[PDB]
Design a protein around this ligand. Structure first.
Ligand code: F8M
Length: 604
């Protein structure tokens, strides 16, 4: 049994969305077989004007047909097989926030879609992840579209409307943190009056309000949580956009013009990957392609507290000198695995990666299809977070080994250049101390040897202290990079994939529990499978957290503690080589005052 039309037909089992106004079914065309989104319920004019609406970020309304049996007005819309943004946020990998690249696609499509709607004059009123569909483009990247804006949601209401830019800020915060900005204790249900009190609290600059106790306080915050998977450079640019659109004051509201301007400023910026080798921290500098490198060093300082003049950059095993006027679009292309390492002559504190330390929530023995579903979603997102941090800690160590293996070669290049200037002084020394011996009232000569022999003696002390550094930069010379290969974790251990095996098992049990919740009750046979796999869900999470802390974190903190000591020894050797090289330049000019002095007397 199923309904049909003159051109389309759909099964009632293939139901997609179910709302108050109508329901949307997954249907096909009677002549082509292509899949369409069939929506089964003044109109003839406001619907044909939605047909001409053609935009990348808007679901195309193809045609309007009338059903056969009930003669109901049926809308033939574009089918989006990936679901809505809410479906994307339900996956455990996005439980603590979307990927940073995926987050930029959402912001670009949402802004690009509403801007086209404002050019035509359509107010969306309700903008939630349920109103934003996802389509895979021809290139493989996601494409987000708007669809439902005709005649919103309890969690995405303005305080004055609770009794346009508001729901957009809640959606972006939800997509960036994986959670809602204003959450009471028992959720926005019976604590609905608390939800209204949270919004009317209007802390202006703050964007979050977590009630971690029943009828307790409201923990405000103006910054993104630590679990946010976005880069620190993106949070600095995203925070003021949300804070200025999350307050009831129309006097202090931004409006679409200032919103579209500042959002376009973020999307027009390219990414420059920079890894602080002395702090063991990876960063992402969001800089426009037309800015100079001076502004680039400014953004590196605002994210690493490194002075611009002290920023010494390394790229692909060689030093990198950035001209203060060199545009950002002419910088070398960088990735997360091949960034621009920044080192400074000043001593820097070794911090490492900062992440939220979360534990496993206890599993309840109550057989509750809704309880086990909400429990499986939270515990699987925790493993995704631990699997995310594990891969980040592995990347930090692998980036650390390359940066250290490069820096020792850059130091050996500075040592070899000192040898070049040493041979220039030794040749000048010998060809001037012996050219006097050939020619040899004598105090004009004896004072030279008492000064030339002091130069050859102090120059020799540089040679002894240089070959010592050559012995320190040798394998096993109290500065070798061999410890980095024999301390932390490696891709050979395959720790990220060992956690990802247990993650897929927990996700399949979660997806099965997600299906078990749709079914109101299970049979006796399926009930025990739901209980047996529920216990396996705990053993998989316990096995992963044990392997995460007792292997990934222990080896990381052992590698980090070893790195903090090697940085001091490296900073100590750089100060000696710099002094020894400076002791070769000042004596290079001290032998210049004597090579022309007595060697060239005056006589007709
Ligand atoms: C990857 N798997 C988990 C997909 C999840 C289920 C699904 C699939 C396709 C869909 O395609 C839609 N296409 C539309 N045009 C509209 C609308 O316009 O409201 C709504 C939907 C869905 O909800 C939907 C859900």
């Amino acid at each position: 049994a199923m309904q049909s039309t003159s051109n389309h037909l759909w099964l009632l089992s293939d139901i997609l969305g179910q709302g108050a106004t109508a329901n949307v079914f997954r249907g096909r065309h009677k002549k082509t077989g292509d899949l369409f989104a069939i929506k089964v319920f003044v109109q003839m004019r406001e619907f044909e004007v939605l047909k001409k609406l053609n935009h990348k970020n808007i679901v195309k309304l193809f045609a309007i047909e009338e059903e056969t049996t009930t003669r109901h007005k049926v809308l033939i819309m574009e089918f989006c097989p990936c679901g809505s943004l809410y479906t994307v946020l339900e996956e455990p990998s996005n439980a603590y926030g979307l990927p940073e690249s995926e987050f930029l696609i959402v912001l670009r499509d949402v802004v690009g879609g509403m801007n086209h709607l404002r050019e035509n004059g359509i107010v969306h009123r309700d903008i939630k992840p349920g109103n934003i569909m996802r389509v895979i483009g021809e290139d493989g990247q996601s494409v987000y579209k708007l669809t439902d804006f005709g005649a919103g949601t309890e969690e995405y209401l303005h305080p004055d409307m609770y009794e346009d830019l508001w729901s957009i800020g809640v959606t972006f915060y939800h997509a960036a943190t994986g959670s809602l900005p204003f959450r009471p204790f028992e959720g926005p249900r019976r604590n609905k009056e608390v939800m209204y009190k949270i919004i009317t609290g209007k802390p202006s600059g703050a964007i979050s309000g977590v009630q971690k106790a029943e009828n307790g306080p409201i923990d405000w915050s103006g910054d993104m949580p630590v679990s946010c998977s976005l880069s620190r450079g993106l949070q600095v640019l995203l925070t003021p956009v949300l804070a200025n659109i999350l307050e009831a004051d129309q006097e202090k509201c931004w409006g679409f013009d200032q919103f579209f301007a500042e959002t376009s400023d973020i999307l027009h910026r390219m990414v420059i990957h920079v890894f602080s080798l002395q702090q063991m921290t990876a960063h992402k500098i969001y800089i426009h392609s037309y800015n100079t490198a001076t502004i680039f060093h400014e953004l590196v300082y605002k994210q690493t507290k490194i002075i611009s003049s002290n920023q010494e950059l390394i790229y692909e095993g060689r030093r990198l000198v950035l001209e203060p006027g060199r545009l950002a679009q002419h910088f070398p292309k960088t990735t997360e695995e091949n960034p621009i390492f920044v080192v400074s002559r000043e001593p820097l504190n070794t911090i490492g990666l900062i992440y939220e330390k979360i534990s496993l929530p206890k599993v309840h023995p109550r057989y509750d299809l809704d309880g086990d579903a909400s429990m499986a979603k939270a515990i699987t997102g925790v493993v995704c977070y631990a699997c995310r941090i594990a891969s980040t800690l592995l990347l930090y160590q692998e980036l650390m080994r390359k940066g250290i293996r490069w820096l020792i070669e850059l130091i050996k290049d500075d040592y070899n250049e000192t040898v070049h200037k040493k041979t220039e002084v030794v040749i000048t020394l010998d060809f001037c101390i012996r050219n006097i011996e050939k020619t040899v009232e004598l105090g004009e000569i004896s004072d030279i040897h008492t000064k030339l022999l002091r130069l050859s003696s102090s120059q020799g002390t540089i040679e002894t202290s240089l070959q010592d550094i050559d012995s320190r930069l040798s394998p096993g010379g109290s500065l070798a990079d061999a410890w980095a290969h024999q301390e932390g974790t490696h891709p050979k251990d395959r720790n990220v994939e060992k956690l990802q095996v247990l993650l897929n098992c927990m996700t399949e049990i979660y997806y099965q529990f997600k299906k078990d919740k749709a079914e109101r009750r299970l049979a006796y046979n399926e009930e025990q499978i739901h209980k047996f796999d529920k216990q396996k869900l705990y053993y998989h999470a316990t096995k992963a957290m044990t392997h995460f802390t007792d292997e990934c974190v222990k080896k990381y903190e052992a590698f980090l503690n070893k790195s903090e000591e090697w940085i001091r020894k490296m900073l100590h050797l750089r100060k000696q080589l710099l002094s020894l090289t400076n002791q070769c330049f000042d004596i290079e000019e001290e032998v210049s005052k004597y090579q022309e002095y007595t060697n060239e007397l005056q006589e007709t």
